[PDB]
Amino acid sequence: GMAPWRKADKERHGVAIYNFQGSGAPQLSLQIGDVVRIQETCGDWYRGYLIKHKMLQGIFPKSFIHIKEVIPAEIPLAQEVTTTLWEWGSIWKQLYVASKKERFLQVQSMMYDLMEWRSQLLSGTLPKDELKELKQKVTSKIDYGNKILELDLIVRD
Amino acid sequence: SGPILELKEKIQPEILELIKQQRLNRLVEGTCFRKLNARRRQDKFWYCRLSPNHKVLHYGDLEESPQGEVPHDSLQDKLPVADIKAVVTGKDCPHMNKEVLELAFSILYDSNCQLNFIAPDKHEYCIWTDGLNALLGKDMMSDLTRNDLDTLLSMEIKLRLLDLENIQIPDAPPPIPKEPSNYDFVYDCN
């Protein structure tokens, strides 16, 4: 009797805690921090794909994955910051190459602020009133940033 | 860290590529320099710029006034890149205060020809030395490349680790288990 592949129940999403170099398909190599959707498991292995590259699918060790979730408002807000940071990051590099110094710097500071605030949001260390003021500073910077970079204008959630 | 260093090594190349592109774009925009020991009605300022295709450097004198800086070229107007044999800096410079040593660099080409510069500041010094080296297929060594690398690479890493927030990163590689005994998956691909 060999370990059969079965649907992954509560282990739906995870993040790689180390770089996993696979030996090629069916194994999916992972870089630390990669977020994956886990579809099945069999023994000490998961089968799934990279959330940001769903075409890249395969198996990887359970040991290289930390199971997380993907409800308190600060959580989805934290998620919006992550998504926002990736979109700004791409444009930030183009600002760099074209030497648009003012915009480059402005975007650089907004990214550091958002990363820091997101970390504060996820810390669970802020008292109620302060947290509310922090959420507002976050949504305001996301919206302003999206505006000057000419990205899609988000609507409260 | 172990895995983070590994990730930096994988991304570092593309970042160095962006930096090279930034440096060259700057050369193309060109910069204004101030000649050392210019006198008797000689323009004190001049400029140099790299052609948009990256093959020749155009240069000449300038007119530094409250209004602007109109550039008026002379007979000697260019220095093709393909004819560049070397770039020297500091005491290696033929035209070589001390504050100037740090901003001095020269383009040696053809026979015994040489185009000598005195960067307006450390920043421009790095931009040009990095740019010329890139053109010459050499590595960019300025402190600005090191800082730009650290700035862009650190951001990429932080972005990559966002979802590792409040999660423990092992010191050593987790154990790689034996491969599965079968591959009869429940679901399809894509």
Side-chain angles (χ1 to χ4, degrees):
Chain A
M2 45 188 67
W5 278 93
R6 65 198 174 76
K7 179 185 186 168
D9 48 3
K10 43 183 178 178
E11 311 156 301
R12 295 192 177 188
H13 300 71
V15 56
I17 64 183
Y18 218 87
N19 300 293
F20 170 61
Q21 174 54 66
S23 50
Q27 294 177 19
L28 172 68
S29 288
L30 303 161
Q31 291 179 291
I32 183 165
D34 282 352
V35 178
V36 293
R37 173 70 166 78
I38 294 151
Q39 300 166 286
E40 25 186 324
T41 186
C42 165
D44 310 301
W45 295 84
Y46 286 136
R47 187 194 185 203
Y49 59 78
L50 292 168
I51 287 305
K52 297 174 178 171
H53 294 303
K54 296 188 167 53
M55 296 301 99
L56 304 182
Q57 177 172 28
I59 74 175
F60 39 94
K62 183 181 65 182
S63 65
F64 284 61
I65 298 298
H66 179 280
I67 306 297
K68 67 147 57 182
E69 299 290 55
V70 182
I71 178 177
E74 47 275 26
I75 297 302
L77 179 57
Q79 300 179 294
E80 189 188 338
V81 172
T82 288
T83 295
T84 294
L85 293 170
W86 279 101
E87 300 184 57
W88 290 6
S90 172
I91 293 175
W92 188 62
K93 282 184 293 204
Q94 298 172 296
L95 290 178
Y96 170 76
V97 182
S99 282
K100 298 291 235 301
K101 71 161 295 182
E102 296 70 35
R103 225 62 173 171
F104 178 78
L105 163 61
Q106 173 175 43
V107 174
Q108 183 185 24
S109 303
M110 294 182 88
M111 286 174 300
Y112 296 152
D113 284 351
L114 284 186
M115 297 179 43
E116 167 60 23
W117 298 351
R118 166 174 178 278
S119 174
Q120 286 190 38
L121 283 178
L122 294 180
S123 77
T125 295
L126 273 53
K128 176 193 292 66
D129 307 302
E130 184 174 359
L131 183 62
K132 209 149 187 178
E133 286 291 297
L134 179 59
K135 291 180 180 181
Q136 281 164 49
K137 287 171 176 177
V138 167
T139 57
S140 307
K141 194 163 292 284
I142 287 179
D143 298 335
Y144 183 62
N146 279 343
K147 179 178 182 172
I148 72 175
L149 290 186
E150 301 178 305
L151 297 176
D152 196 58
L153 303 69
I154 304 298
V155 179
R156 186 166 71 71
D157 289 303
Chain B
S1 297
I4 294 175
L5 174 58
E6 304 188 284
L7 182 57
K8 292 181 72 178
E9 306 182 310
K10 286 174 187 163
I11 306 173
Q12 175 145 313
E14 66 187 61
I15 300 302
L16 286 177
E17 182 53 49
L18 279 51
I19 297 183
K20 169 182 173 187
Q21 271 170 48
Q22 184 258 29
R23 298 286 189 267
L24 295 185
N25 288 314
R26 283 291 279 264
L27 292 195
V28 169
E29 290 174 52
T31 74
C32 177
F33 300 88
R34 169 173 178 56
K35 306 165 183 173
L36 73 176
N37 289 165
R39 307 183 188 186
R40 306 305 297 277
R41 38 220 311 182
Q42 307 165 323
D43 300 289
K44 296 178 178 174
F45 303 88
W46 67 291
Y47 75 86
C48 189
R49 71 180 182 179
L50 182 271
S51 53
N53 72 314
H54 303 171
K55 294 177 185 173
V56 178
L57 297 162
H58 294 274
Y59 64 103
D61 288 317
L62 282 168
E63 302 298 63
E64 219 65 353
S65 304
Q67 274 39 57
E69 49 174 53
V70 288
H72 48 67
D73 303 304
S74 297
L75 290 179
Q76 195 144 40
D77 192 312
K78 315 179 200 314
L79 192 180
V81 179
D83 291 320
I84 297 179
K85 222 165 186 174
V87 180
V88 301
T89 72
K91 297 189 295 179
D92 293 316
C93 292
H95 48 146
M96 299 306 258
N97 306 304
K98 162 55 185 57
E99 304 165 58
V100 307
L101 272 297
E102 303 180 61
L103 304 183
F105 65 90
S106 302
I107 299 190
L108 311 174
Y109 62 103
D110 287 310
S111 57
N112 204 302
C113 308
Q114 60 180 57
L115 185 53
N116 309 304
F117 306 67
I118 293 293
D121 53 56
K122 188 59 177 183
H123 193 98
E124 286 312 309
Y125 174 80
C126 296
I127 286 287
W128 283 77
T129 51
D130 289 336
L132 296 175
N133 282 335
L135 291 171
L136 262 46
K138 306 200 174 302
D139 295 331
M140 304 174 127
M141 315 293 304
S142 82
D143 285 340
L144 188 67
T145 284
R146 192 267 199 176
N147 197 257
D148 283 349
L149 182 59
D150 187 11
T151 296
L152 300 165
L153 185 54
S154 285
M155 189 74 83
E156 201 72 52
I157 296 301
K158 292 192 189 324
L159 291 171
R160 296 289 204 117
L161 309 183
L162 287 176
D163 280 306
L164 234 22
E165 182 78 12
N166 295 153
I167 294 170
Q168 209 59 38
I169 295 179
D171 304 76
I176 292 188
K178 191 158 192 174
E179 53 189 356
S181 61
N182 80 78
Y183 299 80
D184 303 310
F185 306 126
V186 182
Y187 304 113
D188 262 6
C189 290
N190 308 299

